RNA sequence: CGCUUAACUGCGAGACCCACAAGUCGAGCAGGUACGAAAGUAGGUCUUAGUGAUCCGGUGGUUCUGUAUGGAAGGGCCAU
RNA sequence: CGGAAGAUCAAGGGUUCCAGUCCAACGUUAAUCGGGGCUGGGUGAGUCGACCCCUAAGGCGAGGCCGAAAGGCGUAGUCG
RNA sequence: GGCUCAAACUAGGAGCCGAAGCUGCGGAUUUGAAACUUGUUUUCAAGUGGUAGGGGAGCGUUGUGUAAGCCUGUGAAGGU
RNA sequence: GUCAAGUAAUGAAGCGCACAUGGUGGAUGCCUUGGCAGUCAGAGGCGAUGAAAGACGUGACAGCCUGCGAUAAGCUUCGGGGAGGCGGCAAUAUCCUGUGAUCCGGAGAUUUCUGAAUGGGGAAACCCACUUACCAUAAGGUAGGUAUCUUGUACAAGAAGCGAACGAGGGGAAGUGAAACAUCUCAGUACCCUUAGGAAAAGACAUCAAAUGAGAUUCCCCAAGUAGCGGCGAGCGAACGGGGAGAAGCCGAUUAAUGCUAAUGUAGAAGAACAGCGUGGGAAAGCUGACCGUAGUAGGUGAUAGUCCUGUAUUCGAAACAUUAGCGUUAACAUAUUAAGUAGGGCGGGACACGAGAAAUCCUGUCUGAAGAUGGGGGGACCAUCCUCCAAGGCUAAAUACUCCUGACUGACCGAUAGUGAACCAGUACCGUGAGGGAAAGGCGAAAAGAACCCCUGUGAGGGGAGUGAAAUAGAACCUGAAACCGUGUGCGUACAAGCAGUAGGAGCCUCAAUUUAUUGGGGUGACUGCGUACCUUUUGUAUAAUGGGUCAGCGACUUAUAUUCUGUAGCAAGGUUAACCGUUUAGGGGAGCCGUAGGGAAACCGAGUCUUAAUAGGGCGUCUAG
């Protein structure tokens, strides 16, 4: 804190509580006793722990009928309406689409739909599999998880 | 995540002051004096909750003593008479009979008086 | 998982941390378990490893003894039960290094009788104990 | 009084005492003796005081180590 | 009161000077009053003082000397 | 206060008062004990004053996800 | 009816409690124009062509702030843009503007005085000059020149000073720790001083190594809190080597200009799609039905909006001037030729993790002093052998350090006692001779619609009407409006009674709701009775006449990073796990390393054994899994 280097008054005689700085944590405008600093919050998950969690989540997704397997999910044009209509016939208006080699026009189609995301199998996180109401995984992408888990 | 304690402190202090209503002066107005008045009131209540049972038995015994002495013997001989006659009536009920129905207590003393 | 709501730590996994000086009911009010006025109750107190309050500490009433050998820090002992990490049949110093059995800076190795081998091995430049030698050749191994 | 060196070496089951560090007693075993004709006795003195840790430095020994290697210096171990 | 409590300055201050107007705050009370607020005005020099020329103490000081660096000293001078 | 064949003292006797002690009635709780068995249930037994201090179980507050949810001008937060 | 005796009720100067209603005050809640920490990029300077900081001016308009400089809220030009505008408090007036204003970007011109300040001086914003050319004739004007030092031939070119951190270098504490203190530590730190660049330094072996050898410097993870050093105390603390980042070696890898070529940057432009009804002051919220989406979690708009506005996704413009890169040219500097007062030595010191130690190696104040490839340095005293490398010439990018700054973006960062000292005219007011220290202080309302007029008053303050507004105890000290504290009203109690002011009882009175009508229940009060010496701290022990607190509100004290040990839980399990890094980045790769799986001994060494011993005896320490 700025300033506060000198003793505000002599130790004895004045009748006031002894003080050593006007920037004491007891004083208004004083420093913070145990002031916060930037810190790292990332933890270590063991490689097998991360793999095991994704195995547990995918297995649970099947058990509660939240995984949807499709042969392929491609869009002819980068149109939001086309994918919104394809999700309706798939009975998943809000879902997480997982495919290998996410298309450059399927990305744009889903980039506006509110509760919809399209991810590569190699950039799927444990939170995404749980947050979304359904998961539409292609058969090709399901094989990737079969090998990587 | 700074936490400001003003709201919780306000209703916490208000809770103590609400419990100090009717107290004189600072004991019902300023928290520092009211908090130890509320604690002291609770200490008195806990002890006076034992003393109540202790004080009403003194009241019953004195009422019974007056009733027995009105017609015949004393309390010390009355309780002995009831004990020998296997009469289980508590001192609470006896003091109520003495103070509210003197005919029954007169008949009740006779049963104790014939037993000694 | 079901949802981000019903994800629980599996009771016993988490324990509440202790906060000192938060009132009478918490069990740590007014002192933090520090006791009363004393050196160990003060802000910067410590136990000071190696101190008995003034009498010469135990590590100074006793004498220093021995010397450190540089050979001992480059000689690794190898167990019979660790040999399953070796690729192939030869067991040498360089072969123990690529199996991550011994440190890369170890110069020589010794094979002792701890577990039991499962396949025939050929030991070239490593010393083998008498008990380990008979266990090696009982599985068809050799020492050269 | 005669002869002597057990005022040994390696130890020591088991205990006493004891915060620790220390301290105390100890049969028995192996080796080498001293005295006795021998069974034996002897690991100082009737016992309980006569004492001072570690560090550091010195000395007598020792294959233990020995900064490329052979040495050596230095260090370690045992005794003081 | 009147060797000031009257006048002229220097220092210091800076508009407190004069007029009109207002009275909330300021004035240890009231205030129509004020060194208060607001709005205008007011300080005219060849001769008074400064500036200017000159120097004292003392500074700074081409070159010079000294000093790890920073700098210290010092001549001619230049300020004061 | 007052008390003298006591309301004093000695030696006896019988009543009674007298505590948060004991019992009676209701309820909670720790530990252990037979089982639909993780508080799934009915009980039983022994416990439950407490500083320093050790152990266990929770409440509330600010912020993050849950949450493009849910509530809210038919009235949020805050205050009373 | 008269007397006597006995005994009620009634009072309130004031006070207590409860409630109702205000004042003060400015908590809380909500809010933000301000901060705090970062990420990815860029840049890393300004100045004698006069800087940074100022002083004084400058407008139709008095002050301050902002801009600007006597061409003075500004002038010229080149671009953009298309209807308002002459900066803010903060309006008014004169006006300007499609003959394109204001406004934004590029360039230019002007640019008072002080300040390195540089013509001399000086108490900064002032005083006094000399000189050249021209003009005027009076007592001047206009345009220049005139500091000092350094490098070149009395002539040209530079420098100066200021400003964040990071670098290099010259000097260099003490508080502290060692439970004292002197060696030592703190620490080569704080501080002082010199000086550079976008980085700096270092850098190619007179280096390690001792293996099967490697191959400059720098930085990160390990090695390892190991080996060592150490009043062998407190502490200090490597290296070899392994895994990475980056890689480069040369004899000019220099600097500064100029011209082409390419790409940025500094203004910009377009940019989809919603209606009805009900509530409401107001619709964005409700209900019904549509539409856009490469644009759906942006900020606003009278309450919460993808379709109202500004925006967003997407596609793009540059007359001008910087910037980056490639080519060419020009001129300044540099261009060693293998290294003698050198290596080594004595003395005294310093640096090496290493405190003289058995002390190698590096530096040097003093005194000395080689060999010079048939040679020399090193391999931790020293000698021999072997290996390695050639000092006494100069350079060299990257990986690394940092933030006065510019842009984009982010936050389990703050939200007005917080966050910067500073959200506000803050480094201000104020304090100090000075160096220096250093505050307080945000919010009407959606829109000022900021209350015409009337009334009381002094043409004052203040208020009441009227009016505006959804709201006016939202009225400018203005959102909400807590507590302390101070009033007013109502009910009850209280003027014969002794004390932590309550508590357990309890009569009476007052007030509400039921009830067939004083019977209960709720609320207020508390005559009278019993009991009862605050709280905290510190103590053997406190009502203590021991400490602390006038009260209220707000703030105020066990944290964070790393190492390690134990416990729980989870994954794997005789195995477990990667670190730095790479990565299109929580994935995946990376096995270097660490722990476990074996101990004994000082060690060599041996190993379910091992040590001691002459001993195979005895004994010590181990053995017969879970990490």
List the beta bridge partners of residue C127.
C110
Pairing of strands A117-120, C75-79: unpaired
* C-beta atoms of C4 and A131 within 8 A: yes
How many angstroms separate the first and last alpha carbons of chain B? 83
Measured between alpha carbons, how far is A54 from A62 in angstroms, rounded to an integer? 12
Measured between alpha carbons, how far is C127 from A5 in angstroms, rounded to an integer? 69
Q: Which of residues 62-81 of A touch C (CB under 8 A)?
A: 64
Q: How far is C21 from chain A (nearest CA, A)?
A: 15
Contact C77, C112 (CB under 8 A): yes
Determine the 3-state secondary structure of A69 from DSSP.
Answer: strand
Measured between alpha carbons, how far is B5 from B25 in angstroms, rounded to an integer? 27
C2 to A55, A114, A130, B113: CA distances (angstroms): 13, 21, 7, 83
Q: Which of residues 6-45 of C touch A (CB under 8 A)?
A: 7
Contact C133, C143 (CB under 8 A): yes
Question: Which residues, 6 or more positions from B57, have their beta carbon under 8 angstroms from its beta carbon?
Answer: B91
How many angstroms separate the first and last alpha carbons of chain A? 52
Tally: H helices and E strands in chain A: 5, 4
Contact C115, C79 (CB under 8 A): yes
Contact B82, B112 (CB under 8 A): yes
State the best of A60, A62, A130 to mutate against chain C, taking most chain C CBs within 10 Å.
A130
Nucleotide nearest to A77 (CA to C1'): G294
Apex CA A30: angle with CA A29 and CA A34, to 5°?
130
Contact B105, B98 (CB under 8 A): yes
Interaxial angle between packed helices B31-70 and B102-113, expressed in degrees from 0 to 180 and rounded to the nearest 10:
60
Secondary structure E strands in C17-106: 75-79, 90-91
Measured between alpha carbons, how far is C99 from A71 in angstroms, rounded to an integer? 44
- Positions 54-73 in A, CB within 7 angstroms of strand G: none
Could you tell me how far CA A51 lies from the centroid of its own chain? 18
* C-beta atoms of A127 and C4 within 8 A: yes
Q: Which residues of A107-142 are buried (b: 16+ CB within 10 A; e: fewer)?
A: ebbbeebeebbbbebeebeeeebbebebbbbbeebb
- Asked whether residue B10, judged by its CB, lies under 7 Å from any atom of the DNA or RNA strand F, the reply is yes
Q: Straight-line distance from CA A39 to C1' G167, in Å?
A: 29
Phi, psi (deg, nearest 5) at residue A128: -65, -35
Residue listed under structure tokens 């079969």:
A146
- Asked whether residue C68, judged by its CB, lies under 7 Å from any atom of the DNA or RNA strand D, the reply is no
Chain A residue at shortest CA distance from C1: A57
Measured between alpha carbons, how far is A99 from A86 in angstroms, rounded to an integer? 15
Measured between alpha carbons, how far is C88 from C94 in angstroms, rounded to an integer? 13
Both tokens of C120, joined, read 């025939």
Resolution (angstroms) stands at 2.7
Q: Does A113 contact C at CB distance below 8 Å?
A: no
Q: Nearest-CA neighbor of A132 among C1, C104, C25, C54?
A: C1
Q: Does A57 contact C at CB distance below 8 Å?
A: yes
Both tokens of B65, joined, read 């003593």
Nucleotide nearest to B6 (CA to C1'): G28
A43 to A46, B36, C14: CA distances (angstroms): 10, 48, 16
Both tokens of C14, joined, read 């988490």
Determine the 3-state secondary structure of C86 from DSSP.
Answer: coil
C85 to B114, C74, C80, C96, C137: CA distances (angstroms): 107, 21, 11, 9, 19
Measured between alpha carbons, how far is C136 from C119 in angstroms, rounded to an integer? 9
Measured between alpha carbons, how far is C23 from A17 in angstroms, rounded to an integer? 25
Contact C112, C129 (CB under 8 A): yes
* C-beta atoms of A60 and C3 within 8 A: no
**Kind and range of the H or E run holding A119:** strand A117-120
- Positions 26-45 in A, CB within 7 angstroms of strand G: 26, 28-30, 32-34, 36-40, 42, 44-45
Q: Does A130 contact C at CB distance below 8 Å?
A: yes
Q: Nearest-CA neighbor of C135 among C75, C79, C77, C76?
A: C79
Both tokens of B73, joined, read 């013997």
H runs (alpha helix) in chain A: 47-63, 80-89, 106-110, 126-131, 139-148
Q: Write down how long chain A is.
A: 149
* C-beta atoms of A60 and C4 within 8 A: no
- For residue C133, how many other CB atoms are within 10 A of its CB? 16
Could you tell me how far CA B14 lies from the centroid of its own chain? 31
Biggest alpha carbon distance in chain C? 75
Residues of A in contact with C14 (CB under 8 A): none
Pairing of strands C90-91, A117-120: unpaired
Determine the 3-state secondary structure of A50 from DSSP.
Answer: helix
Protein contacts on strand G: list nucleotides below 7 Å from a Cβ: 16-19, 27-29, 37-38, 179, 211-212, 223-224, 226-228, 232-234, 240-242, 292-297, 412-422, 427, 437-440, 482-485, 500-505, 524-526, 530-532, 534-535, 537-539, 549, 551-562, 568-572, 574-579, 584-594, 596-599, 601-609, 625
Contact C28, C21 (CB under 8 A): yes
Neighbours of chain B (3+ CB pairs under 8 A): none
List the beta bridge partners of residue C110.
C77, C127
**Kind and range of the H or E run holding A108:** helix A106-110
Q: Nearest-CA neighbor of A135 among C14, C1, C23?
A: C1
């Amino acid at each position: 804190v700025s300033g506060g280097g000198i003793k505000p008054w002599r130790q004895k005689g004045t009748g006031r509580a002894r003080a050593g700085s006007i920037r004491s944590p007891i004083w208004r405008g004083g420093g913070r006793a145990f002031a916060a600093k930037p810190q790292d919050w990332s933890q270590k998950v063991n490689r097998k722990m991360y793999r095991g969690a994704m195995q547990c989540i995918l297995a649970e997704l099947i058990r509660q009928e939240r995984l949807i397997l499709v042969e392929e999910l491609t869009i002819s044009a980068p149109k939001t309406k086309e994918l919104i209509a394809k999700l309706s016939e798939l009975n998943a208006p809000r879902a997480l689409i997982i495919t290998k080699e996410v298309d450059e026009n399927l990305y744009l189609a889903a980039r506006n739909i509110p509760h919809v995301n399209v991810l590569d199998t190699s950039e799927v996180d444990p939170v995404s599999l749980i947050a979304f109401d359904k998961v539409i995984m292609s058969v090709e992408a399901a094989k990737q998880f079969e090998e990587a888990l | 995540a700074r936490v400001k304690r003003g709201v919780q402190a306000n209703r916490r202090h208000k809770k103590i002051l609400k419990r100090a209503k009717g107290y004189y002066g600072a004991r019902s107005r300023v928290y520092r004096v009211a908090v130890q008045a509320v604690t002291k009131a609770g200490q008195y209540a806990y002890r006076d909750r034992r003393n109540k049972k202790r004080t009403f038995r003194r009241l019953w015994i004195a009422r019974i003593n007056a009733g027995a002495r009105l017609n015949g013997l004393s309390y010390s001989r009355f309780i002995n008479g009831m004990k020998k006659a296997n009469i289980t009536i508590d001192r609470r009920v006896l003091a109520d009979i003495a103070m509210h129905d003197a005919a029954t207590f007169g008949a009740l003393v006779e049963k104790a008086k014939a037993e000694l | 998982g079901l949802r981000l709501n019903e994800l629980s730590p599996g009771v016993g996994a988490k324990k509440t941390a202790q906060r000192r000086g938060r009132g009478i009911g918490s069990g740590l009010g007014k002192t933090g378990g520090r006791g009363v006025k004393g050196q160990k109750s003060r802000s910067g107190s410590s136990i000071r490893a190696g101190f008995e309050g003034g009498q010469t500490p135990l590590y100074r009433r006793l004498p220093k003894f021995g010397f450190t050998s540089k050979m001992a820090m480059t000689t690794a002992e190898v167990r019979l039960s660790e040999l399953n990490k070796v690729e192939g049949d030869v067991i040498s110093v360089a072969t123990l290094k690529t199996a991550n059995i011994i440190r890369h800076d170890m110069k020589r190795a010794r094979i002792i009788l701890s577990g039991d081998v499962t396949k025939a091995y050929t030991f070239q430049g490593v010393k083998v104990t008498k008990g380990a030698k008979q266990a090696i050749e009982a599985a068809g191994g050799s020492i050269e």
